[PDB]
Write an enzyme that holds these catalytic residues in place. Structure first.
Site, mmCIF file in Angstrom:
data_model
loop_
_atom_site.group_PDB
_atom_site.id
_atom_site.type_symbol
_atom_site.label_atom_id
_atom_site.label_comp_id
_atom_site.label_asym_id
_atom_site.label_seq_id
_atom_site.Cartn_x
_atom_site.Cartn_y
_atom_site.Cartn_z
ATOM 1 N N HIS A 156 0.863 -1.170 0.000
ATOM 2 C CA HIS A 156 0.000 0.000 0.000
ATOM 3 C C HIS A 156 0.909 1.232 0.000
ATOM 4 C CE1 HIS A 156 -3.749 -2.047 0.019
ATOM 5 N NE2 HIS A 156 -3.675 -2.502 1.256
ATOM 6 N N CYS A 189 0.010 2.586 -4.501
ATOM 7 C CA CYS A 189 -0.717 3.828 -4.752
ATOM 8 C C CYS A 189 0.217 4.971 -4.403
ATOM 9 C CB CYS A 189 -1.999 3.911 -3.922
ATOM 10 S SG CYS A 189 -3.301 2.837 -4.537
#
Lengths: 88, 166, 88, 166
Positions: B106, B154
Site C-alpha cells: 500500500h 498507490c
C-alpha cells in the site's frame, strides 16, 4: 589524496502510477503494473534498453479503461543505456 | 520465460551505439543481486490479496535475467530501512554490474506503507530514503552501476482521471 | 455522456542537477546545463528522441570535474518517442 | 543552428519505430508555443549574471525548432503562476503538437525561487504546481501532446559529491 564522486548517479525508478493517484491490483490475477512490466521485460529485454521498455509499459496503459493508471519513470540519472543482454 | 538476445542482436546493439551502454560482467564470475520487499498483511489496512502472484512473477523474471533474488515480506518502514542498509553493504555488489529493488505495498503520496501504517500513526518509507541508502556514499560498491527501483503502490487516493463530455 | 481521460500524461521534466544539489552558472558564459542542452539539441534533434538527447546530456556530465553536477530527468509520462524532426 | 532531419532520416525513423512516435502537425498550419521564465534580479539573493546568455541561446534554439517563444523575467511565484495559467489557456495549443516550458532561477529543494524569496519569507513555485497547471484538466488543449519542462536551478545547496581516497 581524495577524489570527488557524484553522490547520486545511475538510478532509474519506475512507479505504478502518477503522483496523487491509485494503482490497481486484481485479487486473483495480481497487480496490473507488475504483470504488464513482466510481460514487456520478457518480450523486449532482448532488443531494448530498460528506459525504452518502461516507455513501452506506459504506452500499454495509454487508453484510460475502467481502472485507469499511468506508470511513471522517476529521478533518472542513467548516463548510458542499460541493456540486460538476456542469454549473456 | 525471457526472449534471449542472440549473438547477432548483441553485436548489432554494440554497433548501433558505441560507448554509451552499461558494461556487463562475465557470466561465470558475476554475482548479481536483487531484492523484493512485499507487504501483504497489515495492522490497519486490508490484506493485499493477489500479492503472491506478483512475488512469483517478479522472482522468476529476475532469476531468469541473472539475479540472485532475496524476498522479504510484511515489514515496518524501520525493518525495510534495516533490510536496505544490509542490501547496500552486500560485498557481492562489488562483483555485480547492476541491481534491481522491487517494492510492493500500500502507498500514499509521501511514500510506501510499512505493515503498521495508519492515518493516526504513519509508518512510511520515503523514496528519498531509498535513493539515499543506495547512493555513492552509502552504497559505493554500486557506484557507476545501474540501480533499478520498481514500485507497485498507490501514490495517493485519486482515481487519476478528469472527465470531458461526449 | 462523459468520458475519462488520464489526469497527467505526456510530460517529461529535465532538471540541471540531482535533488539536494547545486547547479552551476558561469557569470559570463552562462549556465553549464543550459549550454550543454543547447549543444546536444543542435546536434541530435535530427536523429534522437528528446529522452535520448537528455540521456546524452547527462552522459556529458559523468566525470565529476571541478564543479560537478548531474542533470536529472523527472516525472516522465511520455508514452511515445518525441522526435522534433527539425526541417519539417 | 540545428542540424536538420533529412527526408531519408525522417522515414528511417518512421520505419525503425512503427506506431510509437508523437505525431507532428503540418508545418504551414501549426502554431507551436514555448515559454521562458527567467529570474535574474532578486530582492535578497545575488544577481544571476550570465542569465542573458541562457535567455538568448534557449530563445534562438526553440525558435529554430519551430516554436513561438514568449519570455518573461523577474517574477514572484504568484506572477509565474498567473503567467503559466495564461499560457495553459492559449488557444494556439489546440493547433500545436507540443510545447516547451523553460524555468531559470535560483532554486532550493522545495522548488524554484520567485524574485522576492528569502529564508525569512519564502517565494517558491513548486514543480508540482507546474505539472498541475499543464495537466489534462487545467490544460486540455495539450492532452496527448508532449510537454517538455526544463529547469535551470539549484535543488538545494549541497555540492552533490562524496569523497573517496586515492
Amino acid at each position: 589524496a581524495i577524489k570527488k564522486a557524484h553522490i547520486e548517479k545511475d538510478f532509474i525508478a519506475f512507479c505504478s502510477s502518477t503522483p496523487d493517484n491509485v494503482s490497481w491490483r486484481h485479487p486473483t490475477m495480481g497487480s496490473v503494473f507488475i504483470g504488464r512490466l513482466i510481460e514487456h521485460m520478457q518480450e523486449y529485454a532482448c532488443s531494448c534498453d530498460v528506459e525504452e521498455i518502461f516507455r513501452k509499459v506506459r504506452f500499454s496503459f495509454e487508453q484510460p479503461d475502467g481502472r485507469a493508471q499511468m506508470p511513471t519513470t522517476e529521478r533518472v540519472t542513467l548516463t548510458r543505456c542499460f541493456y540486460l543482454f538476456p542469454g549473456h | 520465460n525471457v526472449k534471449l538476445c542472440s549473438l547477432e542482436e548483441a553485436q548489432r546493439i554494440w554497433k548501433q551505439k558505441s560507448a554509451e551502454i552499461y558494461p556487463i560482467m562475465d557470466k561465470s564470475s558475476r554475482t548479481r543481486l536483487a531484492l523484493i520487499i512485499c507487504n501483504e498483511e497489515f495492522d490497519s489496512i486490508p490484506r493485499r490479496t493477489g500479492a503472491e502472484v506478483d512475488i512469483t512473477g517478479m522472482t522468476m523474471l529476475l532469476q531468469n535475467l541473472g539475479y540472485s533474488v532475496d524476498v522479504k515480506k510484511n515489514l515496518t518502514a524501520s525493518d525495510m530501512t534495516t533490510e536496505l542498509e544490509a542490501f547496500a553493504h552486500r560485498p557481492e555488489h562489488k562483483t555485480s554490474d547492476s541491481t534491481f529493488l522491487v517494492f510492493m505495498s500500500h502507498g500514499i503520496r509521501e511514500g510506501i506503507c510499512g505493515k503498521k501504517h495508519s492515518e493516526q500513526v504513519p509508518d512510511i518509507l520515503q523514496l528519498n530514503a531509498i535513493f539515499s541508502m543506495l547512493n555513492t556514499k552509502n552504497c559505493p560498491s554500486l557506484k557507476d552501476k545501474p540501480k533499478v527501483i520498481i514500485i507497485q503502490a498507490c501514490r495517493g487516493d485519486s482515481p487519476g482521471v478528469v472527465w470531458f463530455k461526449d
